[model samples]
Target: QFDLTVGITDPEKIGDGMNAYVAYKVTTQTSLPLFRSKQFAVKRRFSDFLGLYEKLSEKHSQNGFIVPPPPEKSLIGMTKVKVGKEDSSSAEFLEKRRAALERYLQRIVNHPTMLQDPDVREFLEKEE
Candidate 1:
């Protein structure tokens, strides 16, 4: 059961009083036995990715495993989008973000070592 897969499908750009954030949908599937379910969809934020990165980094990177940090979005982009033509630059900005997060997920899923990482497991299973 070596088939493990992850997709960064939906990105919801939520902007409220000071809680503006990006929530990326993580669609995960696996043939591995340790996973509690066959597949799942968790719409997670960048914060979740950051937490998982730090968790893996601290728990395993002392042994030299580097958990690649996911990319963060821009205040500049947000401000520009607010003032500039609504649909213009934002399309480019979010597309780049999608590229980075997709690769980040790809990196985590393919690694035989980190694939079984407890943080990865928790990230996929826990909606919180």
Candidate 2:
């Protein structure tokens, strides 16, 4: 229902132990006028993605739109990835998180009411 497309890939490891985290490579390409470019990419953490959903839900849930469900933050699985608890092959659980994250973003991008959304602007533009 919209022209926006987003890609989430390369969930990179950022640290170690309890402080470690995943940063996804977020690529966005769209023909929408509000977007400053036809295509661009950024690195964002899962928390960052959830924050966008928070603002969107705040704006929409009070009225009519049901903001799409955000990705699940699987603490156990993520901790496994965060701590290299996957041994040498982490595909089973690690990739599951990635898949959900991508779907969450896609749902948001494809929603008609989500276009020209300013929170998305902050999500895509900021350096955080």
Candidate 3:
């Protein structure tokens, strides 16, 4: 018994010492058998989504469930070149990744067996 939805909430540019990156806040609403019938909201980031994807894909491949791929990272998006600063392309790329990650989670939630996965449930329910 599980249901969940992934939404892209706050989008902001954050700096990591030397480079700036757009960090999108991902919120997952989950209702699971272990949650006592009450839905829980879990906040995550793009990196968290990546972790979930890897855990799901590699660990559950024996079940033959098709794990959806997370949004691919771009060189320009991760570079320290600072050339794409304040450009529309950077904003556009973030928007695309946000939508892609949302869709990936939707696909995972749609799978009946996948929804029951422990890793997935933890991924959706766990706190940072």
Best by lDDT: 2
* Pairs in steric clash, model 2: none
Q: Where does candidate 1 stray beyond 4 Å?
A: 14-18, 54-91, 115-117
The residue-by-residue lDDT of candidate 1 on 1-128, one tens digit each, is 23756667656776778878877777777767767466877766667776655565566644555434432233432233445222435655765655556555555665656646666756654566
- Each model's TM-score? 0.57, 0.57, 0.53
Q: Report the Cα lDDT for candidate 1.
A: 0.59
- What's the residue-level lDDT of 68 in candidate 1? 45
Q: Point out the worst 10-residue segment of candidate 1 by lDDT.
A: 71-80
Against the unseen true structure, what C-alpha lDDT does each candidate score? 0.59, 0.60, 0.55
Pairs clashing within candidate 3: none
Task: Rank candidates by lDDT, best first.
Answer: 2, 1, 3
> What are the RMSD figures for all models against the true structure?
8.0, 7.3, 7.7
Model 2 scores a TM of: 0.57
Candidate 3 lands at a TM-score of: 0.53
TM-score of predicted structure 1: 0.57
lDDT of 2 by residue, 22-120 (tens): 777777777778664777777767677766655655666445555344433335322334552124356455656565565666656666456347666
Is candidate 2 or 3 superior in TM-score? Answer: 2
